[PDB]
Structure formats: structure tokens, C-alpha cells
Design an enzyme around this catalytic site. Structure first.
Site, PDB file in Angstrom:
ATOM      1  N   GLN A  26       0.843  -1.187   0.000  1.00  0.00           N
ATOM      2  CA  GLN A  26       0.000   0.000   0.000  1.00  0.00           C
ATOM      3  C   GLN A  26       0.879   1.238   0.000  1.00  0.00           C
ATOM      4  O   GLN A  26       1.735   1.392   0.876  1.00  0.00           O
ATOM      5  CB  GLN A  26      -0.933   0.017   1.218  1.00  0.00           C
ATOM      6  CG  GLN A  26      -1.978   1.126   1.191  1.00  0.00           C
ATOM      7  CD  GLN A  26      -2.705   1.281   2.516  1.00  0.00           C
ATOM      8  OE1 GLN A  26      -2.290   0.729   3.535  1.00  0.00           O
ATOM      9  NE2 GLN A  26      -3.805   2.023   2.502  1.00  0.00           N
ATOM     10  N   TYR A  50      11.356   1.425  -0.921  1.00  0.00           N
ATOM     11  CA  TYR A  50      10.061   0.751  -0.897  1.00  0.00           C
ATOM     12  C   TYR A  50       9.718   0.149  -2.255  1.00  0.00           C
ATOM     13  O   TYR A  50       9.240  -0.989  -2.335  1.00  0.00           O
ATOM     14  CB  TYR A  50       8.967   1.720  -0.440  1.00  0.00           C
ATOM     15  CG  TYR A  50       9.042   2.093   1.032  1.00  0.00           C
ATOM     16  CD1 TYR A  50      10.161   1.782   1.795  1.00  0.00           C
ATOM     17  CD2 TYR A  50       7.989   2.751   1.657  1.00  0.00           C
ATOM     18  CE1 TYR A  50      10.237   2.121   3.130  1.00  0.00           C
ATOM     19  CE2 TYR A  50       8.057   3.098   2.997  1.00  0.00           C
ATOM     20  CZ  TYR A  50       9.183   2.777   3.728  1.00  0.00           C
ATOM     21  OH  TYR A  50       9.259   3.114   5.060  1.00  0.00           O
ATOM     22  N   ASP A 201       3.995  -4.435   5.053  1.00  0.00           N
ATOM     23  CA  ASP A 201       4.543  -3.085   5.004  1.00  0.00           C
ATOM     24  C   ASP A 201       5.659  -3.009   3.970  1.00  0.00           C
ATOM     25  O   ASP A 201       6.416  -3.964   3.776  1.00  0.00           O
ATOM     26  CB  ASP A 201       5.064  -2.654   6.378  1.00  0.00           C
ATOM     27  CG  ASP A 201       4.050  -1.831   7.159  1.00  0.00           C
ATOM     28  OD1 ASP A 201       3.026  -1.424   6.573  1.00  0.00           O
ATOM     29  OD2 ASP A 201       4.286  -1.579   8.360  1.00  0.00           O
ATOM     30  N   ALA A 202       5.756  -1.858   3.299  1.00  0.00           N
ATOM     31  CA  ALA A 202       6.703  -1.712   2.200  1.00  0.00           C
ATOM     32  C   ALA A 202       8.149  -1.620   2.672  1.00  0.00           C
ATOM     33  O   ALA A 202       9.062  -1.846   1.870  1.00  0.00           O
ATOM     34  CB  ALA A 202       6.352  -0.483   1.361  1.00  0.00           C
ATOM     35  N   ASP A 203       8.386  -1.293   3.942  1.00  0.00           N
ATOM     36  CA  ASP A 203       9.753  -1.254   4.446  1.00  0.00           C
ATOM     37  C   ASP A 203      10.283  -2.633   4.820  1.00  0.00           C
ATOM     38  O   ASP A 203      11.413  -2.733   5.310  1.00  0.00           O
ATOM     39  CB  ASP A 203       9.855  -0.304   5.647  1.00  0.00           C
ATOM     40  CG  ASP A 203       9.139  -0.826   6.878  1.00  0.00           C
ATOM     41  OD1 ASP A 203       8.136  -1.553   6.732  1.00  0.00           O
ATOM     42  OD2 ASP A 203       9.584  -0.503   8.000  1.00  0.00           O
ATOM     43  N   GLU A 233       0.401  -5.381  15.758  1.00  0.00           N
ATOM     44  CA  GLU A 233       0.644  -4.394  14.718  1.00  0.00           C
ATOM     45  C   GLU A 233      -0.104  -4.761  13.446  1.00  0.00           C
ATOM     46  O   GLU A 233      -0.518  -5.905  13.246  1.00  0.00           O
ATOM     47  CB  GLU A 233       2.141  -4.263  14.413  1.00  0.00           C
ATOM     48  CG  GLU A 233       2.914  -3.441  15.427  1.00  0.00           C
ATOM     49  CD  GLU A 233       2.667  -1.954  15.261  1.00  0.00           C
ATOM     50  OE1 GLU A 233       2.031  -1.564  14.259  1.00  0.00           O
ATOM     51  OE2 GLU A 233       3.114  -1.172  16.124  1.00  0.00           O
TER      52      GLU A 233
END
EC number: 2.4.1.-
Length: 307
Positions: A26, A50, A201-203, A233
Site C-alpha cells: 500500500q 520501498y 509493510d513496504a519497508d 501491529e
């Protein structure tokens, strides 16, 4: 039969998420102008690689559909760069958040406030949340005076930062694999209606294939550990089916709580109600039970420094 997990004296079968359960990233961009007019409007520095992390996950998982839910006021050239990213990588599907219909999950703010004004008033005065009751009546008055049709979607559409990302993240995951079909993404291999989805998550860097996962009732979330603490989370959310009743429980909290937060209530509250991680229960035991664990998911390192 295929595994079983126990929490709070209740058995939850380990349900499989097959190796074609799609992945979801996202990126909601608030300032697309910071990128060139012909650049993919996703951050891709060495502090935050990312776009590279998303591609590397698509490279590793060749057969799996890789979803990228985007939003923002992109220029025409930035959308063509995103359109070309879907061409270079056959399993990458770029879904614009505005292309999806979330109205079936929505509720009018005035409906939520009226329900709670009635609910709190039925409680005796020695137990009523007197501060909250006045706040709700205050919130209702401002809705009737400024935007009487304001709803969870429209109100969250106006907020800034993470609370609006988290809102649509939960709703996309309720659509599950159907969101790719709704968005008209062709050729999504083994993507079935009613199927699940795995948000990342993109990280985070995927370094190997996830394979088939086995999760209690087909759900697991990220558990972050900072210092000596741990916390549920939304950095990872994996569901094996659309409209997963745990995420549906998080949404039901949003529909009944006056100021429901998509993270605290839509994810953490929904999970804790769904599995009966009561206030008297061991939060640490719940974290270990519900945690998404995989050797090939790697945490962001650029965060780190001396100590």
C-alpha cells in the site's frame, strides 16, 4: 487434522493460505509532486527503498499475484509509469483506491452517535462515561450542522496520515482476493473469489518464498518488539479468506464505537474480541499465538544506528 493452535482454552485449526494467496502493498502519496512527472510515485531512496522492496517480493514470488494499492493526486505521466510497472512485472497489479467501492462497509456517523447516546443513557449515572456522552452529543451536533451525511468512509477520507491508510487497509483486506477481481486485474494466477490476502509493510524485505502458511483460523498479524515490550501491529496482516470474521469484528467495533480507530479498534480490538484476549488474559501469550512468523520476512535495517 492439518494442525491446531490453542488460546484461552479454545482450539483454532491451523488453516492453510496457499502459495497463490496474493500479497498486498500500500502506498498512499500525499505529495506526488515530490516525484518527477514521469516517475513511479513510490518512495525509493536508500533510506526507504520501498519500490525496490515491492519488486524484490514480486521477483521472489513469481507465481503469486502482487497487489499495490495506491492513492493520491498523481500526474498523467506518473500513472503511465505505474501502468508500465504492471507491464514489466506480470504479477504486479496496481490498484487505485478510488477504483474500489467501499460503501457496503460504511455507516453514517449520525447513526453511530445516536446508538451510543441511547446506550450510555441506559447505564445508571454511577457508571456512565459522562465525559464521553457529552462529547458524542457534541460530535453529533457538529455533523448535523456541517455534514449530516458524514460517514466512516467520508470522515476517514478527510483525515491525514496513517489513520486513513489503516482505514482502507482493513477494508481492502475484507474484500480479500475479490478486490483484484473488482479492480479488473486479468490473469491473476489461481486467484479465487472469496480468497485471502497478505498485507506487508513496504519497508519489509521478502527474501524467500513464503510457501503455504498455517495460521489459527487463517489469520495472523505482525507483532513488533521494541525495548522489552511487544504490541499487535498492522505491518503484516494475513487472512485466508475474504470478509474474515476477525476483521469483520474489527469493523463491527468501528460501527459501534463512537471514535473507533482503524488500528486500535479495527485490528487490535477486533483480534482481541475475536479470540477472547480479555483484559485479564495474557497479552504476551496472545502475541505468540497470533504472531505472523516467517524466516524470509526481514525487518527494515535502515532504522538502526548505534544502539
Amino acid at each position: 487434522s492439518s494442525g491446531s493452535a490453542n488460546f484461552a482454552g479454545v482450539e483454532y485449526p491451523l488453516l492453510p493460505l496457499d502459495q497463490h494467496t496474493p500479497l498486498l502493498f500500500q502506498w498512499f502519496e500525499r505529495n506526488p509532486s515530490r516525484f518527477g512527472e514521469n516517475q513511479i510515485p513510490i518512495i525509493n531512496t536508500q533510506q526507504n527503498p520501498y519500490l525496490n522492496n515491492i519488486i524484490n517480493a514480486a521477483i521472489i514470488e513469481k507465481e503469486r499475484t502482487i497487489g499495490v494499492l495506491v492513492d493520491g493526486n498523481f500526474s498523467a505521466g506518473q500513472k503511465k509509469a505505474l501502468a508500465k510497472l504492471e507491464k514489466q512485472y506480470e504479477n504486479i497489479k496496481v490498484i487505485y483506491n478510488s477504483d474500489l467501492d467501499y460503501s457496503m462497509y460504511d455507516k453514517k456517523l449520525s447513526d453511530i452517535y445516536l446508538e451510543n447516546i441511547a446506550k450510555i443513557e441506559a447505564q445508571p449515572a454511577n457508571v456512565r462515561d459522562e465525559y464521553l456522552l457529552g462529547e458524542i452529543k457534541k460530535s453529533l451536533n457538529e455533523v448535523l450542522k456541517n455534514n449530516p451525511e458524514e460517514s466512516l468512509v467520508s470522515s476517514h477520507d478527510k483525515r491525514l496520515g496513517h489513520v486513513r491508510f489503516d482505514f482502507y487497509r482493513n477494508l481492502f483486506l475484507l474484500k480479500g482476493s475479490n478486490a483484484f477481481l473488482e479492480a479488473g486485474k486479468h490473469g491473476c494466477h489461481h486467484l479465487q473469489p472469496g480468497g485471502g490476502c497478505i498485507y506487508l509493510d513496504a519497508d519489509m524485505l521478502l527474501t524467500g518464498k513464503l510457501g503455504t502458511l498455517y495460521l489459527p483460523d487463517g489469520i495472523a498479524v505482525h507483532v513488533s518488539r521494541k525495548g522489552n515490550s511487544m504490541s499487535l501491529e498492522n505491518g503484516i496482516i494475513a487472512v485466508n479468506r475474504s470478509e474474515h470474521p476477525a476483521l469483520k469484528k474489527g469493523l463491527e467495533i468501528m460501527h459501534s464505537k463512537p471514535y473507533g480507530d482503524p488500528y486500535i479498534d479495527g485490528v487490535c480490538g477486533g483480534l482481541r474480541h475475536y479470540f477472547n484476549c480479555s483484559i485479564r488474559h495474557n497479552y504476551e501469550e496472545f502475541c505468540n499465538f497470533i504472531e505472523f512468523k516467517h524466516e524470509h520476512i526481514f525487518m527494515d535495517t535502515s532504522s538502526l544506528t548505534i544502539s
